PDB file of C-alpha atoms and ligand atoms in Angstrom:
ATOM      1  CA  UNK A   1      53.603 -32.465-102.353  1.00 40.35           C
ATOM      2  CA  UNK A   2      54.628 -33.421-105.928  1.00 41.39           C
ATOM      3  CA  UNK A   3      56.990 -35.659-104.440  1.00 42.98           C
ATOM      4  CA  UNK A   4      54.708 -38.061-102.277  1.00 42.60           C
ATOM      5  CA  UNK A   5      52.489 -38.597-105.541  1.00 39.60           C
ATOM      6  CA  UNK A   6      55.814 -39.366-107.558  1.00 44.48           C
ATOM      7  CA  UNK A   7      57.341 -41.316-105.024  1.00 44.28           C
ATOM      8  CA  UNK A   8      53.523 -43.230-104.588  1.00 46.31           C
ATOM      9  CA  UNK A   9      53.200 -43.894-107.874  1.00 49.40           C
ATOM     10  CA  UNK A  10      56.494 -45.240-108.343  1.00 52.65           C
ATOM     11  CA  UNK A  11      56.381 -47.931-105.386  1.00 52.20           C
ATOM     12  CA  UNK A  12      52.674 -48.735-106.568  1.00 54.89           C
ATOM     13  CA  UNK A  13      54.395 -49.121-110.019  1.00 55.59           C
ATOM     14  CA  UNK A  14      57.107 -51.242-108.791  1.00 55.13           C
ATOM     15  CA  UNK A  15      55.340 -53.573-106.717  1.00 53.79           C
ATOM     16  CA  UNK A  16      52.940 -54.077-109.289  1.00 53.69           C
ATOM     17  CA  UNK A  17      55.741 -55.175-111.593  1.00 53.14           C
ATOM     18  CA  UNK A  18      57.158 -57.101-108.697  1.00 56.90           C
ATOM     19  CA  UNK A  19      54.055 -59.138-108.427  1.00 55.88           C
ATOM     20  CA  UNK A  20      52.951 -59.298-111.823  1.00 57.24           C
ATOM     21  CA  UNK A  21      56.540 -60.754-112.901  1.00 56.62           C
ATOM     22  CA  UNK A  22      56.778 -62.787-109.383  1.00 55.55           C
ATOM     23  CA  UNK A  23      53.425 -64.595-110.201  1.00 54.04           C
ATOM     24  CA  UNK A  24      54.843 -65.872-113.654  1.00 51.70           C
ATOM     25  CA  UNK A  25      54.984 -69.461-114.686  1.00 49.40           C
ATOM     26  CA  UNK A  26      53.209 -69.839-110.711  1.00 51.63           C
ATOM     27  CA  UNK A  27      51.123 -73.145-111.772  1.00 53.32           C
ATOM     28  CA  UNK A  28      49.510 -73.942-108.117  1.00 50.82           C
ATOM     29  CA  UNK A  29      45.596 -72.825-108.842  1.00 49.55           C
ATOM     30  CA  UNK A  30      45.014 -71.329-105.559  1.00 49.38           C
ATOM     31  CA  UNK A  31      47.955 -69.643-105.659  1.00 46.63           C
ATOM     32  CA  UNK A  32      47.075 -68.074-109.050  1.00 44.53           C
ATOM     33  CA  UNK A  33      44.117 -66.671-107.709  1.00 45.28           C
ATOM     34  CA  UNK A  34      46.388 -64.717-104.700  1.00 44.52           C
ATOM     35  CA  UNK A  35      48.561 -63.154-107.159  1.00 46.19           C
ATOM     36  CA  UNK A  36      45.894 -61.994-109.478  1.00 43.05           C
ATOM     37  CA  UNK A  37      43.973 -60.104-105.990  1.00 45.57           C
ATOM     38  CA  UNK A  38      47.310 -58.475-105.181  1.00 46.74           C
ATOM     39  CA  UNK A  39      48.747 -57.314-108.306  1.00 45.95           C
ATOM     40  CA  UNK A  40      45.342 -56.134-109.308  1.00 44.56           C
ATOM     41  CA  UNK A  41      45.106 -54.021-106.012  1.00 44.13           C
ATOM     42  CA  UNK A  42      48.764 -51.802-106.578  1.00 46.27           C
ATOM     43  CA  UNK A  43      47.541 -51.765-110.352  1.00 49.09           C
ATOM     44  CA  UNK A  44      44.721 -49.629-109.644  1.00 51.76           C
ATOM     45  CA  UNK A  45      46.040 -47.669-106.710  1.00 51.88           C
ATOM     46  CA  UNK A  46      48.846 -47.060-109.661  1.00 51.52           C
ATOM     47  CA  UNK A  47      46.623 -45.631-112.151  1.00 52.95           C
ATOM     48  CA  UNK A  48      45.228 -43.042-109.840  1.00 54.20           C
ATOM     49  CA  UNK A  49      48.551 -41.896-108.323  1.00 57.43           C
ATOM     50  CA  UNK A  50      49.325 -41.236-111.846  1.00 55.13           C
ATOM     51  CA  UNK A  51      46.462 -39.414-112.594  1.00 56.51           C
ATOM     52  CA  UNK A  52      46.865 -36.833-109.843  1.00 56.98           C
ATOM     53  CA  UNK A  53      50.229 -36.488-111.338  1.00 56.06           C
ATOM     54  CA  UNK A  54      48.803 -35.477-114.234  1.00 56.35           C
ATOM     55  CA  UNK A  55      46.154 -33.408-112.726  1.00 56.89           C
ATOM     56  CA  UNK A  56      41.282 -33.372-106.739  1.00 58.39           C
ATOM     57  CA  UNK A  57      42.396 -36.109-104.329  1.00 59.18           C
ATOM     58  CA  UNK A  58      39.055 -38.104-104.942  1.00 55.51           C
ATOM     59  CA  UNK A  59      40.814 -40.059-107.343  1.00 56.84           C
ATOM     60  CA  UNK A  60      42.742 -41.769-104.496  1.00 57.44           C
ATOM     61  CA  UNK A  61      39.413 -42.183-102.636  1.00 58.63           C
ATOM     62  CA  UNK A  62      37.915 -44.052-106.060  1.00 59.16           C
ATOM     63  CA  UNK A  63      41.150 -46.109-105.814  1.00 58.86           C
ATOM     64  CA  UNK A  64      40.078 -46.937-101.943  1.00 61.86           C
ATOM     65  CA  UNK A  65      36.346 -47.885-103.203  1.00 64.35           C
ATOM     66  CA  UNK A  66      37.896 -50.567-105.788  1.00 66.00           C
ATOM     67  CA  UNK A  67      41.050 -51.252-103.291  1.00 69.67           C
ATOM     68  CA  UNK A  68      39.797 -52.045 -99.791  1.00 70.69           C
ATOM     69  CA  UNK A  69      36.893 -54.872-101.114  1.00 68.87           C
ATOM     70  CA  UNK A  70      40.185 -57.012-102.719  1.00 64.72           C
ATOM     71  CA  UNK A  71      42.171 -56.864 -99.521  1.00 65.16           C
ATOM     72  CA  UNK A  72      39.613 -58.125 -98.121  1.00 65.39           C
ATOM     73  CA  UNK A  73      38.820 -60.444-100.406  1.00 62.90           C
ATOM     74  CA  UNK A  74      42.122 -61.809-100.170  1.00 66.27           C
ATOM     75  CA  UNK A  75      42.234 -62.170 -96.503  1.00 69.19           C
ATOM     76  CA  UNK A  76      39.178 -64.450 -96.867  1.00 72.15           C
ATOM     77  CA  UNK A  77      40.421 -66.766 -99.062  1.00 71.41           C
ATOM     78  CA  UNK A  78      43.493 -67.256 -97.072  1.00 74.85           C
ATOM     79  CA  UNK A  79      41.463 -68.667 -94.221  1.00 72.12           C
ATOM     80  CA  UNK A  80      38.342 -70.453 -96.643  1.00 72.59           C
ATOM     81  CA  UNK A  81      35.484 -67.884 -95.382  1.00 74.16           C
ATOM     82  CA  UNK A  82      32.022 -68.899 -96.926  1.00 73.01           C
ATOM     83  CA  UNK A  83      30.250 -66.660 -98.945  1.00 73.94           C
ATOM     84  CA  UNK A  84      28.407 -65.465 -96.531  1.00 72.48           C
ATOM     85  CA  UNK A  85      30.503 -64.059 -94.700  1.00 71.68           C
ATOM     86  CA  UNK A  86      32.751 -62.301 -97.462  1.00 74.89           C
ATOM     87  CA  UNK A  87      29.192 -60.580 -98.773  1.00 76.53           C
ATOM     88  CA  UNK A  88      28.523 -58.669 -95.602  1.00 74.86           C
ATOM     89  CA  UNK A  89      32.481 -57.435 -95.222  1.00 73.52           C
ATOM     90  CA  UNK A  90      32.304 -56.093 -99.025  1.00 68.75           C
ATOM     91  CA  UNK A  91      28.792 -54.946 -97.982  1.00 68.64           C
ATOM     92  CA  UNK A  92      30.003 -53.189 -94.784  1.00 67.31           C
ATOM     93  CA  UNK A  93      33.346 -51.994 -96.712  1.00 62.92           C
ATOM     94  CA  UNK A  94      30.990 -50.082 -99.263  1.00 60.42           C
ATOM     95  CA  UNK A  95      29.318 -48.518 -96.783  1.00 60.04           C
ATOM     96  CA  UNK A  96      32.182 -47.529 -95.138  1.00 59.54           C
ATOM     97  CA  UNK A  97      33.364 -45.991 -98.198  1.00 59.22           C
ATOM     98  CA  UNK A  98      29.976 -44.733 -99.528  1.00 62.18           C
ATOM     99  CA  UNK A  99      29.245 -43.061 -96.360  1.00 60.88           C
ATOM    100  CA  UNK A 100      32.844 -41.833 -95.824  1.00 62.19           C
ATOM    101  CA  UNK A 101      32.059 -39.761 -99.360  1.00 61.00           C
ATOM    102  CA  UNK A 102      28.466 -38.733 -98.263  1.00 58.47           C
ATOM    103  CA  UNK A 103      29.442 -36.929 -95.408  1.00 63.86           C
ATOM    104  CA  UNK A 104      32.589 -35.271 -97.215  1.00 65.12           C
ATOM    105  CA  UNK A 105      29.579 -33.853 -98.938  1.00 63.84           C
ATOM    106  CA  UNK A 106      27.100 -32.267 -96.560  1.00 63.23           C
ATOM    107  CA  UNK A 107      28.813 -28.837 -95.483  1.00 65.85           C
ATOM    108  CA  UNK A 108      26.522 -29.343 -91.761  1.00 65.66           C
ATOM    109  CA  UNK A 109      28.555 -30.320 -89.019  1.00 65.42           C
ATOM    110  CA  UNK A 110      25.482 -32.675 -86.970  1.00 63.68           C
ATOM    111  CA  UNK A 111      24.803 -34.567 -90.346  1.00 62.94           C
ATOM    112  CA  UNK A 112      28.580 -34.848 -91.216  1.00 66.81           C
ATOM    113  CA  UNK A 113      29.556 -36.079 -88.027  1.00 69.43           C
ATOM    114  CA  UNK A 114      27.221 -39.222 -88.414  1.00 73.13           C
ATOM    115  CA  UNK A 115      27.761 -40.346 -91.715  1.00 71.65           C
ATOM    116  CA  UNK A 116      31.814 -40.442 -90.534  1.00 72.68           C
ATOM    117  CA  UNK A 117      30.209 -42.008 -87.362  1.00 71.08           C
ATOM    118  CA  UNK A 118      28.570 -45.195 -89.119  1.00 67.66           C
ATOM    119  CA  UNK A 119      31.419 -45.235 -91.368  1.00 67.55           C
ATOM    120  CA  UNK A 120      34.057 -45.800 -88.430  1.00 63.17           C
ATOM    121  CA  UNK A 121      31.178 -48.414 -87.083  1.00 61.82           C
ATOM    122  CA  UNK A 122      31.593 -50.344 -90.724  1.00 62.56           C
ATOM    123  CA  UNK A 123      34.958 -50.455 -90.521  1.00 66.09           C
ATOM    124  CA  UNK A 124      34.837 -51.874 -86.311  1.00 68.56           C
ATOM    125  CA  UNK A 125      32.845 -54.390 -87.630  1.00 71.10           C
ATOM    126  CA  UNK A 126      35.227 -54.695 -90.670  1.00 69.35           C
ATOM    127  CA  UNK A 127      38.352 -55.316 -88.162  1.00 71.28           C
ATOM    128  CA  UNK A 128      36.046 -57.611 -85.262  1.00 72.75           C
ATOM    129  CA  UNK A 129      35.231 -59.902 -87.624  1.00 70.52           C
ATOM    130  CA  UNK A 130      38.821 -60.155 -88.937  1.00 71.88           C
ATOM    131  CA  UNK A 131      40.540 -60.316 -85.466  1.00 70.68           C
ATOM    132  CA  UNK A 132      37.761 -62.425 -83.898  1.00 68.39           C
ATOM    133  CA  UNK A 133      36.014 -64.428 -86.745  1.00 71.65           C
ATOM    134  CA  UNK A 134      38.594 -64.795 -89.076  1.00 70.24           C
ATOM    135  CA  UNK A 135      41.502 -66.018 -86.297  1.00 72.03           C
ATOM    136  CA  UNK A 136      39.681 -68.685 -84.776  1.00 69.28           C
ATOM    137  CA  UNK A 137      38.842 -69.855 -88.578  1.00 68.48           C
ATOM    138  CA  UNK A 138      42.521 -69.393 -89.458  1.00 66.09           C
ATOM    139  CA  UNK A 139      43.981 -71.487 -85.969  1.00 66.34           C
ATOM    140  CA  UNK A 140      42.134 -74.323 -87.394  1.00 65.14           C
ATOM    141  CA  UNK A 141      44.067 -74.455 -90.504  1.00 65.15           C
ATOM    142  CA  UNK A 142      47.573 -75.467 -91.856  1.00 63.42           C
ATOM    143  CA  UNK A 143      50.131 -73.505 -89.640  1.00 62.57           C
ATOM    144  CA  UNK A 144      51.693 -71.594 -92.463  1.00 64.12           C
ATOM    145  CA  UNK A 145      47.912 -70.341 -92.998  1.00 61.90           C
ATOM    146  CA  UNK A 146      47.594 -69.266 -89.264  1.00 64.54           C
ATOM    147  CA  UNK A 147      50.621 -67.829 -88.909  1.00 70.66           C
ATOM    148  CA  UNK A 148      50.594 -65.367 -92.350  1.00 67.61           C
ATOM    149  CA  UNK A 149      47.114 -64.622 -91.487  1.00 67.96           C
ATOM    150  CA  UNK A 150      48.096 -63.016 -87.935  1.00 69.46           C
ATOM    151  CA  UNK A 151      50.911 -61.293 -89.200  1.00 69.32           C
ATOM    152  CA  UNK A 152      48.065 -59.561 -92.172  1.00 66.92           C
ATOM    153  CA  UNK A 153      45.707 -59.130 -90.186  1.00 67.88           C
ATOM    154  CA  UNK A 154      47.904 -56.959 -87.365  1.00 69.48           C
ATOM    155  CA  UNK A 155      49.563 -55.132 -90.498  1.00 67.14           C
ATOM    156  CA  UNK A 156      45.823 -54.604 -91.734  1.00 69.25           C
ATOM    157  CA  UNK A 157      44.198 -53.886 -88.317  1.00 71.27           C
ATOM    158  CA  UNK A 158      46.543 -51.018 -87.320  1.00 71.25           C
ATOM    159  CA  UNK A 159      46.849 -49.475 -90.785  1.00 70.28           C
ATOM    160  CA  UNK A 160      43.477 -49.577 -91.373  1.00 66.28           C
ATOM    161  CA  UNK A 161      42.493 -47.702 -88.184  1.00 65.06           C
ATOM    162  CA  UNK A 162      44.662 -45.035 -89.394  1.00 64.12           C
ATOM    163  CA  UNK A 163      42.830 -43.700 -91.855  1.00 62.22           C
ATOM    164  CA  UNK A 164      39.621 -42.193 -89.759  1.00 60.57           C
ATOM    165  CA  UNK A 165      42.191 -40.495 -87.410  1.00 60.53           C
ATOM    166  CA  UNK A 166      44.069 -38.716 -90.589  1.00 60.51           C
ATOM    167  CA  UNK A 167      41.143 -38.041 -92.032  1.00 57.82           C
ATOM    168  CA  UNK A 168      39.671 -36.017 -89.031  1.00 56.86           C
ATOM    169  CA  UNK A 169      42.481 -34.369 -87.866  1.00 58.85           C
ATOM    170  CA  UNK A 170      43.357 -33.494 -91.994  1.00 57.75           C
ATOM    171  CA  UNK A 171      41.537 -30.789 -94.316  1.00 57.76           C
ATOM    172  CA  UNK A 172      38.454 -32.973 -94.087  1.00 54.35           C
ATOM    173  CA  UNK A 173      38.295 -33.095 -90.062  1.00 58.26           C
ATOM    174  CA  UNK A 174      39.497 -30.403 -87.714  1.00 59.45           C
ATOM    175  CA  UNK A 175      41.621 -28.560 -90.438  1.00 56.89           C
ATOM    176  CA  UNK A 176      45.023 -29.070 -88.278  1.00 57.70           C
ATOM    177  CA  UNK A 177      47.171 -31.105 -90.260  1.00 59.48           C
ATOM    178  CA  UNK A 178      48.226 -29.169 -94.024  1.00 60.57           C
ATOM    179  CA  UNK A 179      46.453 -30.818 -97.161  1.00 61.64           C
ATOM    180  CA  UNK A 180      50.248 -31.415 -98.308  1.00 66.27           C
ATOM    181  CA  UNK A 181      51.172 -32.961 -94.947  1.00 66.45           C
ATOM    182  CA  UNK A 182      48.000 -35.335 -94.855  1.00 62.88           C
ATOM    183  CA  UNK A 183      49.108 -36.207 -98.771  1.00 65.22           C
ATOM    184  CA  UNK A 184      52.475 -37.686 -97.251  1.00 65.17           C
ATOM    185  CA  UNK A 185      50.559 -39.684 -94.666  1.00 64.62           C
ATOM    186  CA  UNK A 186      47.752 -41.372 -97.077  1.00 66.45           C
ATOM    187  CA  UNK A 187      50.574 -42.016 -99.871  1.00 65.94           C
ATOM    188  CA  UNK A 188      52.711 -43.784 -96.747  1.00 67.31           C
ATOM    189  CA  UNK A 189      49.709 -45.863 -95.657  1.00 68.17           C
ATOM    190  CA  UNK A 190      48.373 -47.374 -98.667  1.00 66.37           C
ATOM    191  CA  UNK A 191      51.628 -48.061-100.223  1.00 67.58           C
ATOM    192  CA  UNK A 192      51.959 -50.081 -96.669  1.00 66.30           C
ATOM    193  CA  UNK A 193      48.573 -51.400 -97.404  1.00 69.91           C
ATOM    194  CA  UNK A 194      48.751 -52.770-100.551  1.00 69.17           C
ATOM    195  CA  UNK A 195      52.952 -53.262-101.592  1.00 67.95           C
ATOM    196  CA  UNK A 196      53.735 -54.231 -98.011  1.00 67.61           C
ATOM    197  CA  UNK A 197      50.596 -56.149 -97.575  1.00 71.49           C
ATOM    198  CA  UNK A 198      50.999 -57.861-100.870  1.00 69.13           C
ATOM    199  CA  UNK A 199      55.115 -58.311 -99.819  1.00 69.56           C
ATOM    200  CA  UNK A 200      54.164 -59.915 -96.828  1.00 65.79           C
ATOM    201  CA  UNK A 201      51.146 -62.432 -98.832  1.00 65.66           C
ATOM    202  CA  UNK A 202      53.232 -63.919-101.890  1.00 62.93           C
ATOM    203  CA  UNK A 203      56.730 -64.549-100.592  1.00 60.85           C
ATOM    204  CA  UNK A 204      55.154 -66.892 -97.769  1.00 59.64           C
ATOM    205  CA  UNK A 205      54.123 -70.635 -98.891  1.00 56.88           C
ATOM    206  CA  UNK A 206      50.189 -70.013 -97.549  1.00 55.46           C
ATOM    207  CA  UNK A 207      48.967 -68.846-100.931  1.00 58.42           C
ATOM    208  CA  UNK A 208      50.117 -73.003-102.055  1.00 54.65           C
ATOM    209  CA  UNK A 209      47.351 -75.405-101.918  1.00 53.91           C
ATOM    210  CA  UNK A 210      49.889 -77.913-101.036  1.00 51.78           C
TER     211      UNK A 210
HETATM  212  C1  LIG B   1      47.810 -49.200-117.884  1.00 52.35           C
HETATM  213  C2  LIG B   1      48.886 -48.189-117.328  1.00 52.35           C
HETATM  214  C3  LIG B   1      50.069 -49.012-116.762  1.00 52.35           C
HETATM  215  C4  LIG B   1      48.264 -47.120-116.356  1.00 52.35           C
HETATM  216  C5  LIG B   1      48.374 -45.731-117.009  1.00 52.35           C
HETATM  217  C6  LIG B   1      47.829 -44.508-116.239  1.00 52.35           C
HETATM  218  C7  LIG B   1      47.621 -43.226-117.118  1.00 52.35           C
HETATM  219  C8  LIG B   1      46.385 -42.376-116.609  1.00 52.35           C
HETATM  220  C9  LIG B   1      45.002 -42.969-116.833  1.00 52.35           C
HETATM  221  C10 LIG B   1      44.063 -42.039-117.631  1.00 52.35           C
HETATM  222  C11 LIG B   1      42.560 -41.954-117.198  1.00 52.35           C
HETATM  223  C12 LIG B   1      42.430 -41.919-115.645  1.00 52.35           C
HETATM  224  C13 LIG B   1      41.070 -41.816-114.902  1.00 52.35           C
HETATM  225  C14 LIG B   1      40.606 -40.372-114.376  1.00 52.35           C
HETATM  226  C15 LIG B   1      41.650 -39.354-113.665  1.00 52.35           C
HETATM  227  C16 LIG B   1      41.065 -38.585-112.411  1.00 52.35           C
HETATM  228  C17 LIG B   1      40.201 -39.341-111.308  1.00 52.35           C
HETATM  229  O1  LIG B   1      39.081 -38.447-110.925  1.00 52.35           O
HETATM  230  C18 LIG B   1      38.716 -38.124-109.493  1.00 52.35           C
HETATM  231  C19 LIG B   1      37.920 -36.781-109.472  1.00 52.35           C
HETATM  232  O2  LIG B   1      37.448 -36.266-108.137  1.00 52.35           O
HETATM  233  C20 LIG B   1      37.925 -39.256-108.834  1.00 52.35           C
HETATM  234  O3  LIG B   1      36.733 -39.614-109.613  1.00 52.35           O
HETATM  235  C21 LIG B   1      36.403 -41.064-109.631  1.00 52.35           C
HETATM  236  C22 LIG B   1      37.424 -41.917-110.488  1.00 52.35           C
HETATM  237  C23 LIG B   1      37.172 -43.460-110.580  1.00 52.35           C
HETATM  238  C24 LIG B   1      38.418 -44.211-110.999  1.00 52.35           C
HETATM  239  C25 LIG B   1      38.886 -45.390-110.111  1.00 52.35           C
HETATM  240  C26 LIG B   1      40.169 -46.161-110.545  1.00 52.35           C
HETATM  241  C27 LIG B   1      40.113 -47.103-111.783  1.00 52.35           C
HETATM  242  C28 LIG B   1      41.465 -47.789-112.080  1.00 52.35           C
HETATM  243  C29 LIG B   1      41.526 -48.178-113.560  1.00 52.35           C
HETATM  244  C1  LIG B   2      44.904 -48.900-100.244  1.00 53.48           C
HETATM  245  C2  LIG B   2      43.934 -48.267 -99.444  1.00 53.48           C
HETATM  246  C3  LIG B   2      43.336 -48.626 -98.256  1.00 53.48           C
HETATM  247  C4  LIG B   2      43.643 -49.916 -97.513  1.00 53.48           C
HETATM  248  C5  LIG B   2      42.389 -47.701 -97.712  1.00 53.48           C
HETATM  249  C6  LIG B   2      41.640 -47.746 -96.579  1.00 53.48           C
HETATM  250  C7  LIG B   2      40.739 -46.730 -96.117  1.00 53.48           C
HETATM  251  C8  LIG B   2      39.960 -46.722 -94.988  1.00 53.48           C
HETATM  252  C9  LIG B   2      39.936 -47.876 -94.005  1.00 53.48           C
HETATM  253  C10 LIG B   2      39.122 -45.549 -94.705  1.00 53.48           C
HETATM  254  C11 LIG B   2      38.272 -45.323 -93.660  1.00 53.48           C
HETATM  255  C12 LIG B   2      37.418 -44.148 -93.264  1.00 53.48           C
HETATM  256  C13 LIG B   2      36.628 -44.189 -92.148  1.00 53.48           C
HETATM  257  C14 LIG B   2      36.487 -45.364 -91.200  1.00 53.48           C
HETATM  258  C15 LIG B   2      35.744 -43.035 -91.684  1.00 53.48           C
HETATM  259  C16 LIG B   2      35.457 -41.986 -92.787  1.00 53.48           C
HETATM  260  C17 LIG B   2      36.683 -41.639 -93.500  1.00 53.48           C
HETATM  261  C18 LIG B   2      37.452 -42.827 -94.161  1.00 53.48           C
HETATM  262  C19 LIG B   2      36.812 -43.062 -95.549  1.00 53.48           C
HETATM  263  C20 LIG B   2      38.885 -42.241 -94.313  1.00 53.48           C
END
């Protein structure tokens, strides 16, 4: 298990660097703005890694709280949501978190089960509004816009969804997959949700104004 938060906090560290030094001497505005999102998202996930090298696993799920709002603030700016709109996904993502952490903390089963229940619904609504609201919004735009978008939003969609299913099946759920096993899987999807994500963002030309 030592190894997955080594090897996690090493690819957080290195994509961090990555980006950080990538971003450098970047004068485009709007671009600016991309680079600061995504290297701030691996910074953070970074930190806590590191912390749990040093040290329960609640520091990754503080990292999630800050994490998961940023993504998501990124994919909006991509395809120019209004404010409205961004609001009620951050508001919906901190429920989804908040309630995710307030049923990890009632010990009966009926209560439990429905705070993880209207956390799943925050994050449906989470992943409708990106697949359905924020596509049509992002066909209407420059291709380069349209076509990154899909490609982060199917990355996000599918990664994203795999978090419930770990978590029930894990120490948290059921009890059926080992707390060092599930350890493997988180480390594995958030470095895919934040290095690969952020990969996938800044080496494509839709962060440019033009
Ligand atoms: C600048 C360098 C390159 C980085 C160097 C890293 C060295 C370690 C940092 C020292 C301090 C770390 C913070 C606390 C640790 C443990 C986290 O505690 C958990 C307990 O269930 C979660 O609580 C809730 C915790 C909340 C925290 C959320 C994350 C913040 C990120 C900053
Ligand atoms: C870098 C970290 C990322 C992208 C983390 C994402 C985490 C989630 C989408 C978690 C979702 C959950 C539910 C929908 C139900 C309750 C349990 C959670 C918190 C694991």
């Amino acid at each position: 298990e030592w190894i997955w938060l080594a090897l996690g906090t090493a690819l957080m560290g290195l994509g961090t660097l990555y980006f950080l030094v990538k971003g450098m001497g970047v004068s485009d505005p709007d671009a600016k703005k991309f680079y600061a999102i995504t290297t701030l998202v691996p910074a953070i996930a970074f930190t806590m890694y590191l912390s749990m090298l040093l040290g329960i696993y609640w520091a990754r799920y503080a990292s999630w709280l800050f994490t998961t709002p940023l993504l998501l603030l990124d994919l909006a700016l991509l395809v120019d949501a209004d404010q409205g709109t961004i609001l009620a996904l951050v508001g919906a993502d901190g429920i989804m978190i908040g309630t995710g952490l307030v049923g990890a903390l009632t010990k009966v089963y009926s209560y439990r089960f429905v705070w993880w229940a209207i956390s799943t619904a925050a994050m449906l609504y989470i992943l409708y509004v990106l697949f359905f609201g924020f596509t049509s919004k992002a066909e209407s735009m420059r291709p380069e816009v349209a076509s990154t978008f899909k490609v982060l939003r199917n990355v996000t969609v599918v990664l994203w969804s795999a978090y419930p299913v770990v978590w029930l099946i894990g120490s948290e759920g059921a009890g059926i997959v080992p707390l060092n096993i599930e350890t493997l899987l988180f480390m594995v999807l958030d470095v895919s949700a934040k290095v690969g994500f952020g990969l996938i963002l800044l080496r494509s030309r839709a962060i440019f104004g033009e």
